[PDB]
Amino acid sequence: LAPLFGLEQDRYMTAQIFELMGIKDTHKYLLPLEQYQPPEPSPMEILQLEMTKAQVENVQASSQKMIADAFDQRERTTFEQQKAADELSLRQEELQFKQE
Amino acid sequence: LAPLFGLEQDRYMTAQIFELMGIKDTHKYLLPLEQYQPPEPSPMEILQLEMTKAQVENVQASSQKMIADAFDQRERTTFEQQKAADELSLRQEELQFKQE
């Protein structure tokens, strides 16, 4: 039942209890809900959220690096195969030329 | 109800209790809210916040380094391909020249 029992209901119950005994409630720290404003977030939680975001971004970057290096290895293998074929062709051509 | 029950309300409640028994309250450590000022932050929390900021910045720098090295690998592969093509062209030209 916590979701239904919000701040306003708790304040109303406390005010009823006070009216039963403490007729006056606004005289002290107790603040009417009308003038209440949400607390300002603290820097600690903000920086913790930023650190979590940075960590998840780092995980994503690591995955991106994995895929990128896989692609780089594929490209390097293809280039090596092409260069080997070209070198073989050049060697055959030179051999034939010198034999002629 | 903690957000509504601020410092002023707590001080007012304590003052009411004292007036019920301890008519005089300002005679000792108790300080009127008018003259109260927020406590000065301690160096420990400041340096902890600085360390957290440094750590998140280091995470961001690690991500930047990952992307930068990925780009560097791409550029190196492109340069290697271009140099291989140029070397093949030069070898073919030299072979044709010497055969002629």
**Which chain A residue has the Cα nearest residue B74?**
A72
Please give the backbone phi and psi of residue A41, each rounded to the nearest 5 degrees, phi first.
Answer: -60, 145
Dihedral sign computed on CA atoms, order B35, B38, B42, B43: negative
Q: Which residues of A touch B86 (CB under 8 A)?
A: none
Q: Six-digit token pair at B72?
A: 């560097």
Residue of A nearest to B92 (CA): A90
Phi, psi dihedrals of residue B3, rounded to the nearest 5°: -55, -40
Question: What distance in Å separates the CA atoms of residue B97 and residue B100, rounded to the nearest whole number?
Answer: 5
The Cβ-side half-sphere exposure at A21, using a 13 Å CA radius, reads 3
C-alpha dihedral, A17 to A18 to A23 to A27, nearest 10°:
-160
Q: Which two tokens stand for residue B1?
A: 């109800």
Of A11, A47, A13, give the one whose Cα is nearest residue A29: A11
Contact, B5 vs A29, CB < 8 A?
A: yes
Closest by Cα among B80, B91, B70, B75 to A79: B80
CB atoms A57 and B63 under 8 Å: yes
Q: Identify all chain A residues contacting B47, using CB atoms and an 8 Å cutoff.
A: none
Cβ–Cβ gap B70/A90 under 8 Å? no
Other CB atoms within 10 Å distance of the CB of residue B55: 13
Residues 6+ apart with CB under 8 A from B64: none
DSSP state of B6: -
Q: Please give the helix or strand (H or E) that residue A79 lies within, else none.
A: helix A43-99
C-alpha count within 13 angstroms, C-beta hemisphere, residue A72: 18
